[PDB]
Amino acid sequence: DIMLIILTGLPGVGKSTFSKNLAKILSKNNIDVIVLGSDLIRESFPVWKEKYEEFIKKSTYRLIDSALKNYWVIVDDTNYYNSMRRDLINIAKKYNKNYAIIYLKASLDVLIRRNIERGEKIPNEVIKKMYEKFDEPGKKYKWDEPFLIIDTTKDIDFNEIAKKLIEKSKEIPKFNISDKIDKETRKIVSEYIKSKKLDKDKIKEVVELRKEFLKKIKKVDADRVLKEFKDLLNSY
Amino acid sequence: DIMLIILTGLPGVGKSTFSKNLAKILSKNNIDVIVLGSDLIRESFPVWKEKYEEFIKKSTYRLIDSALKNYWVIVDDTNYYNSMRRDLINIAKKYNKNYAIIYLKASLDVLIRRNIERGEKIPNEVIKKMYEKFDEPGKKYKWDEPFLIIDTTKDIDFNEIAKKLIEKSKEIPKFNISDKIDKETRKIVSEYIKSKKLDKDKIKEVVELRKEFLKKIKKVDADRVLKEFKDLLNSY
RNA sequence: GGCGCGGGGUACCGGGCUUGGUAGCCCGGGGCUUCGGCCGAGGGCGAGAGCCCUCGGGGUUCGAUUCCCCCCCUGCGCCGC
RNA sequence: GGCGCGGGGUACCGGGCUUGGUAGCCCGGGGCUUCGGCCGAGGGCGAGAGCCCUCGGGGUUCGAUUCCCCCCCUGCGCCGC
Ligand SMILES: Nc1ncnc2c1ncn2[C@@H]1O[C@H](COP(=O)(O)OP(=O)(O)OP(=O)(O)O)[C@@H](O)[C@H]1O
Ligand SMILES: Nc1ncnc2c1ncn2[C@@H]1O[C@H](COP(=O)(O)OP(=O)(O)OP(=O)(O)O)[C@@H](O)[C@H]1O
Ligand SMILES: [Mg+2]
Numbered sequence: 182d183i184m185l186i187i188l189t190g191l192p193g194v195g196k197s198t199f200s201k202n203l204a205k206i207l208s209k210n211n212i213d214v215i216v217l218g219s220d221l222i223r224e225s226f227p228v229w230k231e232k233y234e235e236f237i238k239k240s241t242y243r244l245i246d247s248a249l250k251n252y253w254v255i256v257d258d259t260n261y262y263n264s265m266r267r268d269l270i271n272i273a274k275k276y277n278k279n280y281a282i283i284y285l286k287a288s289l290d291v292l293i294r295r296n297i298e299r300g301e302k303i304p305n306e307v308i309k310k311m312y313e314k315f316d317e318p319g320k321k322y323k324w325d326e327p328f329l330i331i332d333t334t335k336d337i338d339f340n341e342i343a344k345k346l347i348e349k350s351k352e353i354p355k356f357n358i359s360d361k362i363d364k365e366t367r368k369i370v371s372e373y374i375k376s377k378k379l380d381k382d383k384i385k386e387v388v389e390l391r392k393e394f395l396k397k398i399k400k401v402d403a404d405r406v407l408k409e410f411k412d413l414l415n416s417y
Numbered sequence: 418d419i420m421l422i423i424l425t426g427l428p429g430v431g432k433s434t435f436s437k438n439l440a441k442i443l444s445k446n447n448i449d450v451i452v453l454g455s456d457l458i459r460e461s462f463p464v465w466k467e468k469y470e471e472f473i474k475k476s477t478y479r480l481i482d483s484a485l486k487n488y489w490v491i492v493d494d495t496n497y498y499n500s501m502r503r504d505l506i507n508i509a510k511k512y513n514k515n516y517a518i519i520y521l522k523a524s525l526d527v528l529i530r531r532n533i534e535r536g537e538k539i540p541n542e543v544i545k546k547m548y549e550k551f552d553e554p555g556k557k558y559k560w561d562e563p564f565l566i567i568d569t570t571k572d573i574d575f576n577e578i579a580k581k582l583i584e585k586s587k588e589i590p591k592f593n594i595s596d597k598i599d600k601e602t603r604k605i606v607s608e609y610i611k612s613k614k615l616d617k618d619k620i621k622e623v624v625e626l627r628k629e630f631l632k633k634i635k636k637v638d639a640d641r642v643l644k645e646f647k648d649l650l651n652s653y
Numbered sequence: 654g655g656c657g658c659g660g661g662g663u664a665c666c667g668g669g670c671u672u673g674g675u676a677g678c679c680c681g682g683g684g685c686u687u688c689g690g691c692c693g694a695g696g697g698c699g700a701g702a703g704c705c706c707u708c709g710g711g712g713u714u715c716g717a718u719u720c721c722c723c724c725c726c727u728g729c730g731c732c733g734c
Numbered sequence: 735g736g737c738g739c740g741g742g743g744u745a746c747c748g749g750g751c752u753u754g755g756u757a758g759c760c761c762g763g764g765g766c767u768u769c770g771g772c773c774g775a776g777g778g779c780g781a782g783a784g785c786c787c788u789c790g791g792g793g794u795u796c797g798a799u800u801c802c803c804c805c806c807c808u809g810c811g812c813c814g815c
């Protein structure tokens with residue numbers, strides 16, 4: 182009963198602290214889970230250069246891809262774009278494992294407060310830019326729907342979230358004659374019409390006649406039935 | 418000028434703190450270096466089970482293997498067995514990169530002190546068991562020689578260690594007629610001896626005669642020369 | 654640290670290869686020396702020129718650098734999680 | 735969030751397929767009904783039985799569920815590092 186748990190949300194919301202507690206409790210229920218995020222590797226360098234980013238991503242993924250085979254992974258990343266959550270979902274997909282988006286939610290102002298409280302190690306306007314740029318889980322894709330939405334300002338029940346989750350892990354992942362007779366009578370009708378120069382009124386008649394011929398048949402040998410039809414019109 | 422820097426030493430010695438400072442200074446010299454160790458992953462789980470160890474090792478290696486292609490790696494592990502340092506050396510080998518063992522050294526008692534000071538989060542007798550089990554760098558293999566031996570009790574010069582290192586990165590990694598005539602005369606001698614029933618004294622003579630025939634030749638046409646020899650003995 | 658393997662233990666110093674004939678050849682480095690070439694150490698005898706003895710121990714042998722068992726120096730394999 | 739694609743916008747509810755003949759068939763689900771079968775909504779007329787009109791907007795058309803342009807509902811693609 183393994184599954185990829187895809188946290189999501191802006192910085193300051195409390196993903197890491199969440200992860201740790203979720204992990205700890207989950208593990209209290211004898212479940213082997215590892216917590217992975219790009220920061221794990223981002224912060225192994227002694228400084229940040231944009232060029233590290235290519236490596237940090239490829240590495241963090243391989244990590245996740247590799248771990249999921251054997252363990253619950255809790256992905257501790259911001260995951261703001263929906264392609265980001267797809268990219269993760271695809272690893273789960275690859276191994277046919279369940280997943281669970283968890284949208285640690287909080288209003289821009291509690292976020293702005295929380296950054297400030299953290300010494301604004303990130304320009305406040307970047308929380309604000311990450312806000313206006315965040316893709317709401319589920320707003321565009323049904324696969325993207327949050328399995329949960331946690332309010333971080335409020336107290337937080339991990340016994341409950343654990344319960345709910347394992348329950349989820351228990352799922353297996355969610356990843357002619359009548360035609361010929363019909364479409365061939367339509368054709369015969371388009372001939373008789375477009376050939377016998379019927380007027381609108383007799384048009385409607387043969388049309389209804391066809392619908393009524395058809396009702397009788399349902400109540401059966403294609404060719405037989407079509408001469409039958411051709412005949413019916415000749416008469417009428 | 419990339420290279421794998423293989424720290425080594427017991428727990429309590431100060432590898433991680435060392436790594437950080439070494440990295441920081443190295444990076445001050447505009448060198449892209451990442452610090453990797455199995456603990457990076459060991460401590461992403463919320464608890465320790467022996468079964469995690471298979472995964473932690475395979476993962477930590479792939480990490481190192483992957484990073485070395487682009488960056489200096491500083492391996493922050495205990496690396497107590499010599500096969501352990503080989504296993505690392507082999508990744509460097511694989512990519513033809515230099516390496517540098519760094520033996521953060523300290524006596525068992527400073528180690529015992531340091532553990533105690535860390536609240537003996539590891540049974541003192543396991544530092545002591547890791548001591549009696551540690552393989553001294555270089556004691557068995559020349560490839561295993563320490564490029565450096567740091568004393569942790571003492572102050573510590575990273576400007577110097579940085580200097581020394583990059584200097585090291587600047588290296589490119591360190592990874593018949595006369596016979597026939599000789600061995601064929603030996604044979605002719607073993608015949609003449611084992612056939613002409615020579616006594617020990619005449620044995621020595623033909624032997625010396627051979628060594629003297631040979632000296633003349635050096636001063637040349639195999640077959641020619643060997644009839645020449647066969648002749649020389651017939652006479653003598 | 655186990656258990657193993659290679660090279661060396663012959664002679665200017667390294668490295669490699671060949672060999673039951675007292676060793677030999679190849680590559681790199683050094684030395685003496687007309688020319689040709691030549692070469693290390695300890696002990697004994699000799700004014701000297703020179704001569705004897707040895708080259709880690711043991712055995713197969715006329716003869717071991719080579720084959721075999723110990724051992725020392727080197728270098729390396731796997732593994733010791 | 736860009737730019738796109740599929741399904742639906744006809745009628746018991748879902749899902750799929752076929753089709754210029756007023757729609758049809760397949761699978762899953764529900765309802766009424768002797769038997770055979772039958773079915774959704776709004777408006778107008780009718781005591782009633784029943785009858786007229788409409789099914790998002792527009793055009794090619796006798797005729798559009800189908801072809802074409804808007805739009806709404808669904809579901810999805812790539813990408814937005
Ligand atoms: N419920 C809370 N109330 C107040 N402050 C909080 C709360 N949760 C987290 N924080 C603060 O937010 C800061 C970020 O820590 P944490 O790792 O929890 O954040 P995060 O949002 O997961 O980080 P990231 O930017 O990777 O998402 C911490 O300093 C922490 O004190
Ligand atoms: N020079 C030093 N003097 C005193 N204490 C030290 C010194 N260096 C490290 N320590 C202590 O040793 C403890 C271990 O920290 P550190 O990460 O430096 O150790 P470590 O030996 O690298 O860990 P590991 O067990 O992974 O080798 C730390 O709590 C630190 O305070
Ligand atoms: Mg964090």
Ligand SMILES: [Mg+2]
Nearest residue numbers: 432433434456
């Ligand atoms: Mg440490």
